[PDB]
Amino acid sequence: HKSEVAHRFKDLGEENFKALVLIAFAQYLQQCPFEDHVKLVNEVTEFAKTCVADESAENCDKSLHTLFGDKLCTVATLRETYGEMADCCAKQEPERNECFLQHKDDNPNLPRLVRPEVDVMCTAFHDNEETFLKKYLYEIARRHPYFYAPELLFFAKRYKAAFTECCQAADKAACLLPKLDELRDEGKASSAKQRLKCASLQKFGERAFKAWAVARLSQRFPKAEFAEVSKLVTDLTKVHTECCHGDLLECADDRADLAKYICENQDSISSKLKECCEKPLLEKSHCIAEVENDEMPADLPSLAADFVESKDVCKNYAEAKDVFLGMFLYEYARRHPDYSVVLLLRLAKTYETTLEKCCAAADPHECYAKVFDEFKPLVEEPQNLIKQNCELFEQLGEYKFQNALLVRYTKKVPQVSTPTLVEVSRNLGKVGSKCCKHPEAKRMPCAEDYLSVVLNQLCVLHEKTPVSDRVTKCCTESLVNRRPCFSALEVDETYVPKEFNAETFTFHADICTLSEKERQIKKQTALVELVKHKPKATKEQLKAVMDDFAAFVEKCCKADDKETCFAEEGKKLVAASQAALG
Numbered sequence: 404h405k406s407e408v409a410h411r412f413k414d415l416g417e418e419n420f421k422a423l424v425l426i427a428f429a430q431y432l433q434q435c436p437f438e439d440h441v442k443l444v445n446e447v448t449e450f451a452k453t454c455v456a457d458e459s460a461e462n463c464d465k466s467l468h469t470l471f472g473d474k475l476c477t478v479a480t481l482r483e484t485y486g487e488m489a490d491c492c493a494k495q496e497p498e499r500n501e502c503f504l505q506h507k508d509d510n511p512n513l514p515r516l517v518r519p520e521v522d523v524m525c526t527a528f529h530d531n532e533e534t535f536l537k538k539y540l541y542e543i544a545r546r547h548p549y550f551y552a553p554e555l556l557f558f559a560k561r562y563k564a565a566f567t568e569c570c571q572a573a574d575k576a577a578c579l580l581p582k583l584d585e586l587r588d589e590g591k592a593s594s595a596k597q598r599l600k601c602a603s604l605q606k607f608g609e610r611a612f613k614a615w616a617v618a619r620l621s622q623r624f625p626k627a628e629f630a631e632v633s634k635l636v637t638d639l640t641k642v643h644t645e646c647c648h649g650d651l652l653e654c655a656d657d658r659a660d661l662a663k664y665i666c667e668n669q670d671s672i673s674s675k676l677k678e679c680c681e682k683p684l685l686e687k688s689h690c691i692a693e694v695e696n697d698e699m700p701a702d703l704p705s706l707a708a709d710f711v712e713s714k715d716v717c718k719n720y721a722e723a724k725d726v727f728l729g730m731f732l733y734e735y736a737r738r739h740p741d742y743s744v745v746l747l748l749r750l751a752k753t754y755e756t757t758l759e760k761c762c763a764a765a766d767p768h769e770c771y772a773k774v775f776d777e778f779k780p781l782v783e784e785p786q787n788l789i790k791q792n793c794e795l796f797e798q799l800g801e802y803k804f805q806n807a808l809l810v811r812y813t814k815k816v817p818q819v820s821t822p823t824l825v826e827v828s829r830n831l832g833k834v835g836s837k838c839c840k841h842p843e844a845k846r847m848p849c850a851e852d853y854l855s856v857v858l859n860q861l862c863v864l865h866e867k868t869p870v871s872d873r874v875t876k877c878c879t880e881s882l883v884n885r886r887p888c889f890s891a892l893e894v895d896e897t898y899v900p901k902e903f904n905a906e907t908f909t910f911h912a913d914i915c916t917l918s919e920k921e922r923q924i925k926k927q928t929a930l931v932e933l934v935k936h937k938p939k940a941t942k943e944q945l946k947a948v949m950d951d952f953a954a955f956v957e958k959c960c961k962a963d964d965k966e967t968c969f970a971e972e973g974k975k976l977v978a979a980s981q982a983a984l985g
């Protein structure tokens with residue numbers, strides 16, 4: 404293209420252009436104020452219009468990287484506020500952008516973004532809508548500089564819909580606060596999801612990612628031929644390889660290239676991609692990534708023919724092992740959309756281990772004739788774990804299901820900090836509530852996606868403040884073995900109970916005048932410390948202590964004098980539980 408800036412403006416549209424340029428500036432210049440960035444965005448946008456007007460205008464033939472880096476290098480405070488990052492301007496084009504990207508600070512030390520009160524938010528939404536959402540877009544971008552810029556925009560667009568709807572509702576807080584929470588969880592999950600994919604790419608290599616890709620693409624596109632899924636695995640692998648490097652423009656191009664190829668070959672890939680492929684270039688690749696699984700062919704035979712009983716199984720394996728294993732993973736995944744990707748990866752790993760051992764034996768065909776039986780216990784293990792917990796979720800609420808996990812996982816790794824234990828257990832129970840509402844066919848893929856988010860957060864929190872070697876092993880093993888490693892955690896018998904601290908089990912009147920969440924988290928914090936103090940306590944004893952606690956908190960703010968009931972009745976509750984335990 405003659406003018407790269409002109410085309411992107413022509414296709415993104417002015418609004419998408421300014422917002423993406425705002426995000427881009429924020430992720431590079433994370434310390435500059437909002438007003439400074441708006442000025443750069445407007446200047447870049449005004450210049451972009453000259454290129455749309457005449458692509459031959461001055462500097463309109465420069466590349467986006469060149470033009471973007473020039474504007475960064477015009478910042479007056481570059482050396483004062485970012486220091487070493489101002490040395491990037493002494494370099495040009497390839498080396499300059501790579502220098503700037505290297506100086507992206509993934510975790511800057513900016514203050515916590517406080518969510519204002521609803522009435523303040525709705526008033527700022529109406530008095531200045533553009534400035535309201537745009538500043539927040541700037542605040543999030545600068546705090547997540549590797550967050551893919553379109554997805555960051557895509558979430559921001561949904562925030563406007565939440566405010567428009569709820570700011571005119573009867574109970575605005577009842578409408579808005581849940582939606583802001585879903586989006587905030589949706590975004591933090593997505594952020595952790597791509598950074599996790601990149602770490603796994605560089606920690607376990609391209610081969611392991613290509614295995615994961617065959618499984619995920621074959622489930623999604625089960626009518627697609629193996630040669631087709633294979634080609635899409637290689638392209639998607641280069642896309643993620645480049646996007647993990649971190650340059651927005653090359654990532655956007657690689658994603659748009661693949662999203663274009665898939666859309667021009669829908670007849671050979673999937674039926675579900677028409678609506679996605681009619682969306683603008685900005686949304687194409689994101690839409691395709693969220694497309695639902697296509698229906699698999701009706702009468703597909705079992706895999707026993709080509710992979711177990713047929714002669715040449717070892718011959719076809721040894722001529723090109725990753726081709727053969729890829730064919731096995733493709734055939735298995737496309738028939739089992741109800742399996743998690745890591746489950747199918749466990750299956751291919753077992754199939755690979757069997758062929759390697761058996762093809763070296765005297766009678767290989769006899770050695771691997773029973774290989775399909777080795778898959779069953781691997782398949783049943785998550786399926787049974789889903790039913791135990793979803794049945795447990797049906798019996799209890801989401802809250803009381805969280806309380807069960809609270810007790811369960813405190814006994815397994817009691818060394819984990821109480822805030823991490825409360826947060827991760829609350830999140831795990833929420834994985835239950837969401838995924839246990841899906842029929843059997845959709846339960847395990849649900850759990851894998853949302854367990855990967857919760858467990859990674861657990862492993863992120865644990866990496867920075869190590870406290871348990873077993874959790875470290877689960878966090879450093881293959882992602883395929885992550886969840887089964889955590890599910891293999893047994894109760895820590897070497898733990899010595901934590902010493903009783905009366906102030907930890909002392910409650911004041913603040914508990915009854917608290918938000919439903921802080922009230923739950925404070926009750927759940929006291930539950931963790933209760934288990935940490937009497938770990939060998941049975942469920943009848945604990946249920947008895949939680950039952951007396953329910954009446955204790957129910958009555959002390961059901962009385963005329965609330966403040967001192969909590970200390971006097973708390974002295975009654977704690978001493979009785981002390982005797983009822985140990």
Ligand SMILES: CCCCCCCCCCCCCC(=O)O
Binds near residue numbers: 524543584
């Ligand atoms: C990542 C997309 C934009 C994120 C900014 C949220 C939308 C701005 C309106 C203010 C909402 C408060 C944000 C929050 O507390 O979750």
Ligand SMILES: CCCCCCCCCCCCCC(=O)O
Binds near residue numbers: 610726751
């Ligand atoms: C006949 C066309 C050749 C296509 C080759 C595709 C190879 C797929 C790579 C993924 C192999 C996964 C094997 C594994 O690690 O378990």
Ligand SMILES: CCCCCCCCCCCCCC(=O)O
Binds near residue numbers: 553652685687
């Ligand atoms: C740095 C140049 C300023 C404008 C930013 C270019 C737009 C980035 C996203 C382009 C659309 C990518 C769509 C996709 O993910 O496939």
Ligand SMILES: CCCCCCCCCCCCCC(=O)O
Binds near residue numbers: 597619693
């Ligand atoms: C982080 C999303 C990667 C962007 C490239 C995806 C291009 C469309 C292929 C989507 C097929 C499913 C692969 C996936 O799970 O992301």
Ligand SMILES: CCCCCCCCCCCCCC(=O)O
Binds near residue numbers: 887
């Ligand atoms: C507290 C957990 C609630 C949801 C129950 C899910 C337990 C089974 C997860 C195993 C399937 C995840 C993917 C896998 O490991 O194959």
Ligand SMILES: CCCCCCCCCCCCCC(=O)O
Binds near residue numbers: 812831854
């Ligand atoms: C750090 C406390 C341990 C964290 C617990 C991680 C377990 C993830 C859910 C595993 C599936 C639910 C049932 C199980 O543990 O077998």
Ligand SMILES: CCCCCCCCCCCCCC(=O)O
Binds near residue numbers: 908948
């Ligand atoms: C050893 C001192 C005993 C006090 C320990 C109190 C433990 C609080 C359990 C949390 C209450 C669960 C019931 C609920 O939140 O509805």
